[PDB]
Amino acid sequence: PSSIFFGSKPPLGSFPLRGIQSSQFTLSNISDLLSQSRPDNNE
Amino acid sequence: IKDFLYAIGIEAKKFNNERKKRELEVIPPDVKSALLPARTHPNLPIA
Amino acid sequence: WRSFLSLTSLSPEEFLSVYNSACSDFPECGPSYRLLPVEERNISCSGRDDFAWGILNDDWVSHPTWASEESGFIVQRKTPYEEAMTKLEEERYEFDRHIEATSWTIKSLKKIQNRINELPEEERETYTLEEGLGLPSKSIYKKTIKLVYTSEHAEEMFKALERMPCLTLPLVISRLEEKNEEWKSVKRSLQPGWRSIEFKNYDKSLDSQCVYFKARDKKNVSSKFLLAEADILRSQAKLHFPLRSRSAFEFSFVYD
Amino acid sequence: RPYVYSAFMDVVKALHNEIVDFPGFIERISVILRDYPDLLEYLNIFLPSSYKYLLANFTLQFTTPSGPVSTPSTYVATYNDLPCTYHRAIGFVSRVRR
Amino acid sequence: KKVSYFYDEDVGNYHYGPQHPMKPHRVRMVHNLVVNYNLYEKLNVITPVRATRNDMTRCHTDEYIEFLWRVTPDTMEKFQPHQLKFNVGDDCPVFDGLYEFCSISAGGSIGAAQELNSGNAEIAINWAGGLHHAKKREASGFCYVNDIALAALELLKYHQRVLYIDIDVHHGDGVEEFFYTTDRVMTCSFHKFGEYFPGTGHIKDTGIGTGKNYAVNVPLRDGIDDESYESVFKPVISHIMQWFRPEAVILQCGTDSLAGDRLGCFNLSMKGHSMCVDFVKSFNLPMICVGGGGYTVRNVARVWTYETGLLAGEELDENLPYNDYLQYYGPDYKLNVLSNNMENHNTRQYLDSITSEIIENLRNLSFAPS
Amino acid sequence: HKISVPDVLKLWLVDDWENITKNQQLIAIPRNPTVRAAIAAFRESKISHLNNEIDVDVFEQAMAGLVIYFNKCLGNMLLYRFERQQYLEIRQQYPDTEMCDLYGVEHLIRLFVSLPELIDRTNMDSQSIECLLNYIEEFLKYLVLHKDEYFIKEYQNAPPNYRSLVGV
Amino acid sequence: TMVDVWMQLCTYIDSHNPIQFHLPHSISSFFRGVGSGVMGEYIETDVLKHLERDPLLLKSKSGTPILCFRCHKSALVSQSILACDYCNSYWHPDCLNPPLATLPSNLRKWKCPNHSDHVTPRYRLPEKAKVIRVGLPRGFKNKGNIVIDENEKPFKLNFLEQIRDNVINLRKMVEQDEQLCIETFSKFDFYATRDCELPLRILCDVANDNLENDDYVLALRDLLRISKWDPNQPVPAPF
Ligand SMILES: [Zn+2]
Ligand SMILES: [Zn+2]
Ligand SMILES: [Zn+2]
């Protein structure tokens, strides 16, 4: 569980630990198309 | 506007029509699809 | 956006799958490659085989300069200190190139002389070499003989060494050694000025902001830019938080 | 400072809706700037990973092991991806078995 | 002694022109620093065998190579038309021993590949090579013969997949054009896109035909530093090694991405340019480390000597030992290349966006039904 | 003194102007439908419906004037600055054949469309002028009708060596 | 006759000096956008009608604020912003989907990604083109692109009552959300932080789950098998 937290650098000889997307200058690096197109809970 | 609502309605129903997926195979790699308990078959008898 | 995805009947996973590929319309071959005519698609390559023909590419050619982006037309302007350092390096390269080329040819000719001299005396007097003296890399020998002698005596000395090697080699070795010693003495005499220039210009060659920071800090110290920053931050807060931002702060400094 | 408040509520909402995968909510404290809300979130967070504040001169976060130190660059969009860890597992087991 | 070091004692004596950036003298500097650091015992030194016209016509055309064999600085005036057709004469000048230098470099590369094939070595070093701007029918960018491509063809006789990693500040245009339509070679190049030399290298150039998603281009802005380069380089190479698992790597260790380069516009240091080599060495794949760019000879010599030592395993000292080129090294006489300030321009958003795009492309090779 | 060019041909001419000049695309010089071939086809089609021998004679001599003027004119006022290299290459390749047997309708229509400004300097009899111009009109109609067979479909990109050769 | 016409044509051409071709002014000035050049070339006439690019823009000539369209920030979270020369929009050169390495040239107009002309097949309109208003209400084949602009209470509330109510409602929603999340802690931890060692279990003790079998498909697609038998679960060897 320790090597999972800030794992954006693959350590030395291992395939990546975690995936990376963009964060459009948000101060909360989540906000994305992921945020704007995911369920929170004449037409 | 009224054309796009009718244009998308037909296309959406056509996609839901083909969304129903029920197939059985053995040794194709095709997609990362819905029904792949196939791969359990060719890998099983050896393991 | 959720309503539009519900209209289109697209799950968010599939939207995330399709986004990056279906947003910007670029040609499939990339924006810098283009197809060739059928004529020049079979130019000769007399060393290829079927295995190489199967792998290498002969259809799509890249854009070196023929698109709107010709090449690098903006040279990065360097600081005077980096320019002084480059000039120093070039001076050193000139001197060292000449000295080492002359020395390499001296050593090669000394090896040839040692071979033909270990050879007994009858063949010593009746021996001969071929055009190039059998050196695998004859260009250095040709160039250094030209430079040390002339643009005119070069051919004379070349034919002389080609015809009569055993007599001619000692003289050319002596001449090359003498000129090499002269060049080495001049280099030793010129070194300290180089050391001084290097010392004086070294650190300022890394300190690039010593030249490029005044023109960038005048803006931050000016007043119009500060007032503009205040106004634009107010507008941004009003757009982000419409209900709040009537109690927000544009700037919050901490003095600890 | 409405930006930090909105960021906090956005990160907690993302953790609810399952976008930011609890390592990913523990980070995204690039909004550190203050030790008091971290000390107050202590008593509500528990893995054995409570934050750790030593003089916020350093903000290394606990774990069952000794705990990672915060990175100088921002908590750069670490989302979870399953095939990666699966291939790492395949490789490690092949190596150990060999 | 699993590192086979190729060096021909003549390579340093070839001269491009009056004030040209490319100087084969750097190879001689590197070799002297090596022989005086005593790496000559831990390495394995092979004087290469020269290439042949039949060996270079594998990737180049017969007329072009015949021209390179026949040209001369004197007969250049009579050979003027074919020159302007073959790009030789303006920035790839015609000098003494052009064919000889090309033969030396290409022989080094082919010998490295043959060593990796025969198994006598696992790392093969050749600094005289790395000319990655040469194309099938014309010279470009101080390059004449694509020894990288010849080496890749020699590796593919025994290896099924080959990776080529360019960290020169320019795009590997020649090698990309060579292997644009094949899936047995993947070409990952990090470069400076915009108003820069090759012009090619958009993030969208990803191959065509069977080689769809096998060219990877990472464009970068002015002034990248060690941390930013690491954050873009380690994820992309790990994802490449995961999805397209190669059996052999060809690393172009070009050092015009350093700080203080006559033609580069980057800010890497000796550590930032060597963490790349370390990350790639860390996978235990056979690898050919070839040279490349680099137009400031002091930085080039010291960085390449450090990288040779790092591949051999020995950690060299910090003080430069007595060599015949000591004055070249500045008022400190150390084995290091510090960075300068040169304010960065690569925002985290930009780097993250380009990385996510590259990752999606590499993933589509195994998602995305056929 | 004016002509009636169909809009499809106007669009094609402007598209070819752009393709050859700005986009660096050329036409394959050895054509499958020859200029002589198209001339003969139109001549046969019109004579097969003509009425009297005087008209037969004037149409025959008009077609003869057309072919000889093409052969004498092509390499002087019918190519852009990006095609002279190709032209000299083709002359070196086939120095015995002739342009009327080499080039195509893509350039025959440049000749046709440019004919007004040439008859502007020429000042022969109005009767001959109107006969020739009506013949050119009917020819343009026939070409735009049989588009599918006479006109090329895709252009060809000039190679890097060709571009370095021309350089203009 | 026309024989004499041919003679006069031949005399003119072999008397005069060759020149390069240019189609008549009628055909040239026919379409909209096309125009000759300095050496007879074809250049589109859509350039900057005003005349280095000003990197950071803060205030507009009309007072309108300069905020990016996608992230709504203000040309200071990133050192450069771009102004669309067709609409009243500004974009960060990093927010565009393929992020622009360098800003475009100040000569050529730049078009933001929010226009429909990026995915239309190019066409050409003649420069005498009366805009026709099509009356067909539904079902009009229009080649996608040539449809021009689709041409066809004062309350005086003055209270902060609704503003106060909205603020309290927002705080209440926030309170409930935080309560639920901070109760689901201590399980988010266990199921998301030990999630790296359960894959190790179902790899070591080879139990077939959907993701294991997908990884094996990934390895087969890497090795490029054709028709032989699959070796085993732990012996496909891209090791
Ligand atoms: Zn380079
Ligand atoms: Zn933005
Ligand atoms: Zn716009």
- Listed residue (G76, G164, G173, A28) closest to D5, CA to CA: A28
Please answer whether residues E223 and E146 qualify as being in contact, where contact means their C-beta atoms are separated by less than 8 angstroms. Answer: no
CB–CB contact B29 E370 (8 Å): yes
Rounded to whole angstroms, the Cα distance separating E177 from E128 reads 22
Closest alpha carbon within chain G to D41 = G182
- Beta-strand (E) ranges in chain E? 3-6, 44-46, 123-126, 162-166, 185-192, 215-220, 248-252, 287-290
Rounded to whole angstroms, the Cα distance separating B13 from C7 reads 11
Ligand 3 centre from G91 Cα, in Å? 9
Three-state SS at E216: strand
Catalytic residue, from E133, E170, E171, E191: name it: E133
CB–CB contact G76 C232 (8 Å): yes
| Test mutation, C32, C33, C40, chain F, max F CBs within 10 A | C40
User: Chain C partners of B8 at a C-beta cutoff of 8 Å?
Assistant: 7-8
Rounded to whole angstroms, the Cα distance separating D49 from E323 reads 55
Please answer whether residues E126 and E291 qualify as being in contact, where contact means their C-beta atoms are separated by less than 8 angstroms. Answer: yes
Interface present between D and F (3 or more CB pairs within 8 Å) = no
DSSP E199: -
- Beta-strand (E) ranges in D20-61? none
Per the annotation, the verdict on E345 as an active-site residue is no
Rounded to whole angstroms, the Cα distance separating E308 from E26 reads 14
Q: Which residue has the tokens 């890399």?
A: C137
What residue type is assigned to position A8 of the chain?
S
The alpha carbon dihedral of E99, E103, E104, E105 has a sign of positive
Ligand sitting nearest the alpha carbon of E189: 1
Rounded to whole angstroms, the Cα distance separating C37 from F160 reads 11
In angstroms, how far is CA G211 from the centroid of its own chain? 34
Three-state SS at E112: helix
Which residue in G138, G206, G217 is closest to B47 by CB distance? G206
Please tell me if residue F78 touches chain E, with a CB cutoff of 8 Å.
no
Please tell me if residue C4 touches chain A, with a CB cutoff of 8 Å.
no
Please report how the helices C138-149 and C165-206 are oriented relative to each other, as an axis angle in degrees rounded to 10.
90
* DSSP string for residues in chain F: ------HHHHHHHHHHHHHHHTS-EE--SS-SS-HHHHHHHHHHHHHTT---HHHHHHHHHHHHHHHHHHHHHHHHHS--TTSHHHHHHHHHH-SSS-HHHH--HHHHHHHHHHHHHHHHH----HHHHHHHHHHHHHHHHHHHHSHHHHS-SS-EEPPHHHHHHH--
Please answer whether residues G184 and D23 qualify as being in contact, where contact means their C-beta atoms are separated by less than 8 angstroms. Answer: no
Q: Assign 3-class secondary structure to chain C.
A: CHHHHHHHCCCHHHHHHHHHHHCCCCCCCCCCEEECCCHHHCCCCCCCCHHHHHHCCCCEEECCCCCCCCCCCCCCCCCHHHHHHHHHHHHHHHHHHHHHHHHHHHHHHHHHHHHHHHCCHHHHHCCCCCCCCCCCCHHHHHHHHHHHHCCCHHHHHHHHHHHCHHHHHHHHHHHHHHHHHHHHHHHHHHHHHHHHHHHHHHHHHHCCHHHHCHHHHHHHHCCHHHHHHHHHHHHHHHHHCCCCCCCCCCCCCCCC
CB–CB contact E137 C43 (8 Å): yes
Three-state SS at E120: coil
Please answer whether residues A20 and E363 qualify as being in contact, where contact means their C-beta atoms are separated by less than 8 angstroms. Answer: no
Rounded to whole angstroms, the Cα distance separating C166 from C124 reads 6
User: Chain E partners of G95 at a C-beta cutoff of 8 Å?
Assistant: 349
Please answer whether residues A20 and D77 qualify as being in contact, where contact means their C-beta atoms are separated by less than 8 angstroms. Answer: yes
CB burial of residue C177 (10 Å; 0-12, 13-18, 19+): middle
Range of the domain at F71: 1-168
How would you classify the pairing of strands E287-290 and E248-252? Answer: parallel
Note residues around ion ligand 3 (Cβ under 5 angstroms): G 84, 86-87, 89, 112
- Listed residue (C223, C245, C222, C247) closest to C235, CA to CA: C245
- Exposure letters G181-198 (e unless 16+ CB within 10 A, then b): beeebeebbeebbebbee
The alpha carbon dihedral of E132, E136, E139, E140 has a sign of negative
> How many contiguous H segments (helices) and E segments (strands) does chain B have?
2, 0
DSSP H/E element including G90: strand G90-91
Please answer whether residues C60 and E180 qualify as being in contact, where contact means their C-beta atoms are separated by less than 8 angstroms. Answer: yes
Q: Which residue has the tokens 């196939």?
A: B38
- Listed residue (D76, D77, D59) closest to D68, CA to CA: D59
Which residue in A37, A39, A43 is closest to C15 by CB distance? A37
Which residue in G10, G20, G30 is closest to F80 by CB distance? G20
> Where do breaks (C to N over 2.5 Å) occur in chain D, by preceding residue number?
55
Which residue in E193, E244, E365 is closest to G101 by CB distance? E193
Alpha helices in D17-79 (DSSP H): 36-42
Query: How many C-beta atoms surround the C-beta of residue E29 within 10 A?
Result: 24
CB–CB contact C243 G67 (8 Å): no
Closest-CA distance, F161 to chain G, in angstroms, reads 22
DSSP G187: T
Q: Phi and psi dihedrals of F138, rounded to 5?
A: -60, -35
Residue C190, C-beta contacts closer than 8 angstroms, at least 6 positions apart: C95
Ligand sitting nearest the alpha carbon of G70: 2
Q: Torsion-angle region of residue C138: left (phi > 0), alpha (psi -120 to 50) or beta?
A: alpha
- Beta-strand (E) ranges in E255-347? 287-290
Closest-CA distance, A12 to chain D, in angstroms, reads 13
Rounded to whole angstroms, the Cα distance separating E150 from E107 reads 9
| F135, F137, F143, F146 alpha-carbon torsion, rounded to 10° | -100
Residue G135, C-beta contacts closer than 8 angstroms, at least 6 positions apart: none
Give the bridge partners for C2, in sequence order.
none
Resolution for the entry shown, Å: 3.2
Please answer whether residues F83 and F103 qualify as being in contact, where contact means their C-beta atoms are separated by less than 8 angstroms. Answer: no
DSSP H/E element including G91: strand G90-91
DSSP E11: G
CB–CB contact E204 G98 (8 Å): yes
Give the bridge partners for E45, in sequence order.
E5
Ligand 1 centre from E346 Cα, in Å? 20
Ligand 1 centre from E293 Cα, in Å? 4
What residue type is assigned to position C109 of the chain?
L
Which residue in F17, F72, F113 is closest to G13 by CB distance? F72
Which residue in D72, D77, D87 is closest to E352 by CB distance? D77
Rounded to whole angstroms, the Cα distance separating E30 from E301 reads 5
User: Chain C partners of F163 at a C-beta cutoff of 8 Å?
Assistant: 66
Which residue in D22, D85, D92 is closest to G188 by CB distance? D22
Ligand sitting nearest the alpha carbon of G114: 3
* DSSP string for residues in E252-269: E---SSBSS-SS----B-
Please answer whether residues C91 and C194 qualify as being in contact, where contact means their C-beta atoms are separated by less than 8 angstroms. Answer: yes
Closest-CA distance, C50 to chain E, in angstroms, reads 11
* DSSP string for residues in A1-43: -GGGSSTTS--SSS--SSEE----S-SSTT-SHHHHTS-----
Ligand 3 centre from G92 Cα, in Å? 13
Rounded to whole angstroms, the Cα distance separating G222 from E362 reads 12
Rounded to whole angstroms, the Cα distance separating F9 from D79 reads 57
Residue C219, C-beta contacts closer than 8 angstroms, at least 6 positions apart: C225
DSSP H/E element including E26: helix E25-37
Query: How many C-beta atoms surround the C-beta of residue E146 within 10 A?
Result: 29
Rounded to whole angstroms, the Cα distance separating E190 from E168 reads 7
DSSP D71: P
DSSP E143: B
Q: Phi and psi dihedrals of E53, rounded to 5?
A: -60, -40
Three-state SS at E123: strand
CB–CB contact G189 D49 (8 Å): yes
Q: How far is CA C21 from CA A20, A31, C4, F85, G115, in A?
A: 18, 21, 19, 41, 18
Residue B6, C-beta contacts closer than 8 angstroms, at least 6 positions apart: none
Q: Phi and psi dihedrals of E334, rounded to 5?
A: -125, 160
User: Chain E partners of G221 at a C-beta cutoff of 8 Å?
Assistant: 365-366
CA angle C166, C171, C172 (to 5 degrees): 95
* Joined tokens for residue E197: 């030399």
Rounded to whole angstroms, the Cα distance separating C228 from C235 reads 11
Give the bridge partners for A20, in sequence order.
D78
Please tell me if residue B29 touches chain E, with a CB cutoff of 8 Å.
yes
Three-state SS at G85: coil
Closest-CA distance, A39 to chain G, in angstroms, reads 15
| Test mutation, C236, C244, C245, chain G, max G CBs within 10 A | C236
- Exposure letters E169-191 (e unless 16+ CB within 10 A, then b): bbbbbbbbbbbbbbbbbbbbbbb
Interface present between C and B (3 or more CB pairs within 8 Å) = yes
Please tell me if residue B10 touches chain G, with a CB cutoff of 8 Å.
no
CB–CB contact E185 C207 (8 Å): no
In angstroms, how far is CA A6 from the centroid of its own chain? 11
Ligand sitting nearest the alpha carbon of E22: 1
How would you classify the pairing of strands F25-26 and F156-157? Answer: antiparallel
Cβ pairs bridging C and E (under 8 Å): 179
Please answer whether residues E29 and E325 qualify as being in contact, where contact means their C-beta atoms are separated by less than 8 angstroms. Answer: yes
Ligand 2 centre from G94 Cα, in Å? 7
**Domain tally, chain F:** 1
Closest alpha carbon within chain G to F67 = G6
* Joined tokens for residue E331: 């008022």
Ligand 2 centre from A26 Cα, in Å? 10
Please answer whether residues D90 and G211 qualify as being in contact, where contact means their C-beta atoms are separated by less than 8 angstroms. Answer: no
* Joined tokens for residue G211: 């993701």
